[PDB]
Amino acid sequence: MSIIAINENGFLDKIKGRNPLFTCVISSIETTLSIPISGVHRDVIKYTPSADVELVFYGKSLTLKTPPIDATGSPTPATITRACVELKNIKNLHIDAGAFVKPKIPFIEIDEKPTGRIEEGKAMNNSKELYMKGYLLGKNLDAELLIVGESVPGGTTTALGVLLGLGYDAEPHELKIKVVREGLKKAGINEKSSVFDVLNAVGDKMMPVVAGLAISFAERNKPVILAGGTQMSAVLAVIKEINKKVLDKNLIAIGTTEFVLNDKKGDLKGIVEQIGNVPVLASKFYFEKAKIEGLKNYCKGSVKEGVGAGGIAVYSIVNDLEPTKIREFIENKFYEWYK
Amino acid sequence: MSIIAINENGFLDKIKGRNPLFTCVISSIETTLSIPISGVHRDVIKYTPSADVELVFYGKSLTLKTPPIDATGSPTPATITRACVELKNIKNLHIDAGAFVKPKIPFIEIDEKPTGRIEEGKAMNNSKELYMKGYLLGKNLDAELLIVGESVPGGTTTALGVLLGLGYDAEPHELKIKVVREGLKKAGINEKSSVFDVLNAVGDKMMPVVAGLAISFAERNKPVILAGGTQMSAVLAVIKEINKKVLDKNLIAIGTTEFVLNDKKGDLKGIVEQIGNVPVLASKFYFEKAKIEGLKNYCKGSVKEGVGAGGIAVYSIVNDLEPTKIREFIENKFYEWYK
């Protein structure tokens, strides 16, 4: 009941009681090394996606030694995901699709090379192969429910490129749009372009992998929560163009945070509307009824989501986790760190 | 009933009907590049472990383009494993623990660096960390039953080193024993040595990973089939010294081929006897009632086992697979290849 639900279509009943697998797909983008399309600082951006999944899987990052909660009590999104993993004993297994630095936990290697130069239109040359790798991997994972998140610094830009390239209406932000517009041009994207032509131009390698995993579960009549926001709407668009029919089973949902579902300029629901009547679910954290400033002002400043935090919280709450156990886990971890 | 069973202890009843996960742990050993302790030829030995798991997971190897069945009809062990995977729809996911060349299928990366120089006593420096990585990975895999095989060229030597080092009585073969005897000496293995001191001296990186995975399943009261022969007996010895108590649950078995269970000089049952009353199971292939020579003479020449072929066949037959469907799968694949 701490869950928002747009076009629910029964989906919450399907995920109740199901044993889940949580997986985060990570990648890096060459563009982000010289064009500030990501908020992640240049001196940590190479380490950041692997540090996220290390924290979720092991409980702390192993190369980045920066605290996961800052001095004001503001948690990184991976900290929220880790809270749900610990509180609800969520099995988790993470996939690399080209992060600059590889995790030091066990991880599934799907592609060692990073996503390329978006502005040159040279994101990928293998999106179709990445999709089939994601599909065959998905066939070999055994769970009642797939929760799949992402951690790609700069993935809001590639998700804009893909939503535009497939024809959708999706509109700092001025620089994001120059990068993709130039990329779609320099790779000659027309309207007879395939979804793989568009991914190869301006996508990120996470998107075809996640699409592959989602379709393989939805084909076997198993629910999928795409745990993210804008980046996940681009994956949904990819799915529709690959296997439109399985979208209609109403087994693929989008899980995000309340902070994303009401973003002034974001309009996640505007995007999903153009794609289809897909369930969209947000989790309520009640961070404002909290002691520390960073947690209390969490809804302000940056739109806060990542590493499947929103979507795994949706699953956790729907399965009887008191929502404020998340807040108190973070608070207890804050005071253990001392900063 | 095409299953041999020594000290069955009820184990076959536990695995009937269980949904399995099959996983192969691969590694390479620096020793094998300059000392002929492996039968695998020097010009394919770097490619061979990854080619095995590619074949099991995808249905063909992707860098080694040599046929998986030779011109006389003799199948590689990975071909038998792939037969069971296809016929019984076995979910499979493979782990790298230092193979020279990495698989081109998705795979779990646990350690990129190969096992070191056995004869120098420098196999590993991280066996305890590899074990915990295997244990934490195992906690995050969801199946009713674990079938875990191996593919390590030269692993018969490291398994001799470990069985000797832990004090067991385990005795071409003359050169294997010089390599390990020198390794145990040059690393000063005494009788106050830990199991991790011995693995760090003359083990292979597959052994602590597999031990970690086995114990994590057996602790949650789930059966494990250690799918191999002599190499797997060394893993059982490692397990006993790490967590002797979970051995007694009678949830960890050894699955191998009939060709291994009756090897003149091997004596698998002699080894397992010194370790404990562990179930040992062999699968019957009836390759002698076959047309092609290589399949008909399969019991002759080389002791034939690898890539969990024996153990996954045990699981498959016990769950109602007609044993000669394996033979006919290989025969049909032989004639498709034409060689």
Buried-state track B289-306, b at ≥16 Cβ within 10 A, e below 16: ebebebbbebeeeebbbb
Sign of CA dihedral B138, B139, B142, B146: positive
Q: Judge: A141–B93 Cβ closer than 8 Å, yes or no.
A: yes
- CA-to-CA dists, residue B317 to A327, B254, B257, angstroms: 51, 15, 12
Using CA coordinates, name the residue in chain B closest to A139. Answer: B91
Rounded CA-CA distance B176/B5 in Å is 30
Alpha-carbon distance A102 to nearest alpha carbon in chain B (angstroms): 10
Longest CA–CA span in chain A (Å) reads 56
Q: How far apart are CA A54 and CA A105, in angstroms?
A: 6
Instruction: Point out the residue among B91, B107, B133 whose CB comes nearest to the CB of A142.
Output: B91
Closest CA to B7 of B336, B328, B195, B272: B272
Instruction: Give contacts of B137 with chain A, Cβ < 8 Å.
Output: 106
Cα(A34)–Cα(A108) distance, integer angstroms:
28
Contact between B31 and B152 under an 8 Å Cβ cutoff? The reply is no
Q: Looking at CA atoms only, how far is residue B170 from chain A in angstroms?
A: 33
- Nearest CB to A106; choose among B19, B106, B109: B109
Q: Which among A188, A11, A23, A26 has a CA at the least distance from the CA of A97?
A: A26
* Closest Cβ opposite residue A140 in set B92, B110, B139: B92
Answer whether A142 sits within 8 Å of B143, measured CB to CB: yes
Using alpha carbons, select from A218, A250, A232 the residue that is nearest to residue A9.
Answer: A250
Residue A328, both tokens: 């108190």
| Sequence letter at residue B248 | D
The residue count of chain B comes to 339
Side chain identity at residue A207, one-letter code? M
Cβ contact, residue pair A92, B140, below 8 Å: yes
Cβ distance B133 to A105 less than 8 Å, yes or no, reads: yes
Q: Write the CA distances from B50 to B61, B226, B243, integer angstroms.
A: 8, 20, 30
A143–B139 CB contact, under 8 Å: no
Using a CB–CB cut-off of 8 Å, the residues of A that contact B are 19, 21, 57-58, 91-93, 95-96, 102, 105-110, 133, 136-137, 139-143
Q: Which of A194, A202, A195, A266 is nearest to A228 (CA)?
A: A266
Contact between B95 and A106 using a beta-carbon 8 Å cutoff: yes
B26/A325 Cα distance (integer angstroms): 41
Cα-based distances in Å from B328 to A165, B262, B287, B292: 49, 24, 10, 11
Task: Report the amino acid identity of residue A16.
Answer: K
CB B134 within 8 A of CB B226: no
The sign of the torsion formed by the CA atoms of B296, B299, B301, B305 equals positive
Determine contact, residues A232/A204, Cβ cutoff 8 Å. Answer: no
Rg of the Cα atoms in chain A: 18
Contact B57 A110 (CB under 8 A): no
| Beta-carbon contacts of residue A58 (< 8 Å; ≥ 6 apart) | A105, B136
* Binary contact (B91, A58; C-beta < 8 A): no
- A59, closest residue in chain B (CA to CA): B136
The answer to whether A245 and A215 have CB atoms below 8 angstroms apart is no
Name every chain A residue with its beta carbon within 8 A of the beta carbon of B110: 106
Tell me the resolution in Å: 2.2
The residues facing A225 across adjacent strands are A147, A253
- Give the orientation angle of helix B195-202 with respect to helix B127-139, to 10 degrees: 110
Residue B121 structure tokens: 């006593």
Tell me how crowded residue A177 is: count the other CB atoms within 10 A of its CB. Answer: 16
**Token pair of B6 as six digits:** 């020594």
- Per CB-CB distance under 8 Å, the chain A contacts of B19 are 142
Sign of the torsion formed by the C-alpha atoms of A205, A211, A213 and A214: positive
Work out the minimum CA distance from A183 to partner chain B, whole angstroms: 29
Experimental method: X-ray
Task: Decide if A31 contacts A45 (C-beta within 8 A).
Answer: no
- Candidates B147, B139, B131, B130; CA nearest to B56 is B147
Q: What is the DSSP string of A114-181?
A: PB-BTTTTBS-S-HHHHHHHHHHHHHT---SEEEEEEE-TTHHHHHHHHHHHTT-----HHHHHHHHH
Contact A136 B58 (CB under 8 A): yes
Judged by CB atoms closer than 8 Å, whether chains meet at A93 and B19 is answered as: no
Taking the C-alpha atoms of A160, A161, A164 and A169 in order, what is their torsion angle to the nearest 10 degrees? 10
Residue type, B277: N
Per 3-state DSSP, chain A is made up of helix, strand and coil in percentages (nearest 5) of 45, 15, 40
Nearest to B121 by CA among B45, B197, B62, B64: B197
| SS3 call for B298 | coil
Cα gap B182→B189, rounded to integer Å: 11
Question: Does the beta-carbon distance from A95 to B106 stay under 8 Å?
Answer: yes
Could you give the C-alpha distances from B174 to B171, B178, B181, B319, in angstroms and in order?
10, 6, 11, 41
Q: Determine contact, residues B133/B127, Cβ cutoff 8 Å.
A: no
Given CA atoms B289, B290, B292, B293 in this order, what sign does their dihedral have? negative
Partner-chain contact A105 B140, CB within 8 Å = no
Which residues on A lie below 8 Å from B107 (Cβ)?
A: 108-109
Q: Looking at residue B74, which CATH number applies to its domain? A: 3.40.50.10210
Give A261-299 as a DSSP string.
HT-TTT-HHHHHHHH----EEEE----SS-SSHHHHTTT
Compute CA distances A11 → A267, A322, B339, whole Å: 22, 20, 52
d(CA A279, CA A255): 9
- Closest alpha carbon to A116 in A30, A46, A42: A30
Structure token pair of residue A293: 């400033």
User: In chain B, which residue ranges form alpha helices assigned H by DSSP?
Assistant: 11-15, 48-58, 77-88, 127-139, 155-165, 173-186, 195-202, 206-219, 230-242, 244-247, 258-261, 268-275, 293-296, 309-318, 324-337
CB contact under 8 A, B133 and A106: yes
Alpha carbons B4 and B290: distance in angstroms, whole number = 21
> Which residues on chain A are in Cβ contact (under 8 Å) with B139?
91
- Which residue reads 């960890």 in tokens? B252
**C-alpha dihedral sign at B272, B273, B275, B281:** positive
Using an 8 Å CB-CB cutoff, list chain A residues near B143: 142
Long-range contacts of the stretch B243-246 (C-beta < 8 A, 24+): B243/B215, B243/B219, B246/B215, B246/B218, B246/B219
DSSP B250-268: S-EEEEEEHHHHT-TTT-H
Check: CB of residue B275 under 8 Å from CB of residue B311: no
Token output for B268: 């698998």
Closest in B19, B93, B109 to A140, CB measured: B93
Q: Provide, as residue numbers in chain B, all residues whose Cβ is less than 8 Å from the Cβ of A106.
A: 95, 108-110, 133, 136-137
> What is the dihedral sign for C-alpha A97, A278, A250, A316?
positive
- How far apart CA A326 and CA A317 sit, in angstroms, is 10
Taking only Cα atoms into account, the Rg of chain B, rounded to an integer number of angstroms, comes to 18
Nearest CA in chain A to B91: A140
Closest residue to A106, CB basis, from B106, B137, B143: B137
Which H or E run includes B95? strand B95-97
The shortest C-alpha distance from B277 to chain A (Å) reads: 32
CA distance A115 to A97: 8
Amino acid type, B119: E
Q: Do B141 and A102 count as a contact with CB atoms less than 8 A apart?
A: no
Helix-strand-coil percent breakdown of chain B, rounded to 5? 45, 15, 40
**Phi, psi (degrees; rounded to nearest 5) at A21:** -115, 130
Q: How far is A105 from chain B (nearest CA, A)?
A: 7
Backbone angles phi, psi at A75, to 5 degrees: -85, 145
Interface size A-B, in CB pairs within 8 Å, comes to 57
Separation of alpha carbons A253 and A8, rounded Å: 9
d(CA B263, CA B267): 7
Residue B179 — φ and ψ, nearest 5°? Answer: -60, -50
Handedness of CA B258, B260, B266, B269 (dihedral sign): negative
Structural contact between residues B99 and B32, judged by C-beta atoms closer than 8 angstroms: no
- Residue B106 to residue A109, Cβ atoms within 8 A: yes
Between chains, do A142 and B19 touch, taking CB under 8 Å as contact? yes
User: How far apart are alpha carbons A63 and B124 in whole angstroms?
Assistant: 22
What does DSSP say about strands B252-257 and B224-227: parallel, antiparallel, or unpaired? Answer: parallel
Tell me whether residues B91 and A139 touch, CB distance under 8 A: yes
Shortest CA distance from A106: residue in chain B: B110
Residue B137 near residue B110, CB atoms below 8 Å: yes
- d(CA B191, nearest CA chain A) in Å: 33
For residues A327 and A317, give the distance between their C-alpha atoms in angstroms, rounded to a whole number.
13
| Total domain count, chain A | 1
**Burial class, B104, CB count within 10 angstroms (exposed 0-12 / middle 13-18 / buried 19+):** middle
Q: Which domain holds residue B26?
A: 3-337
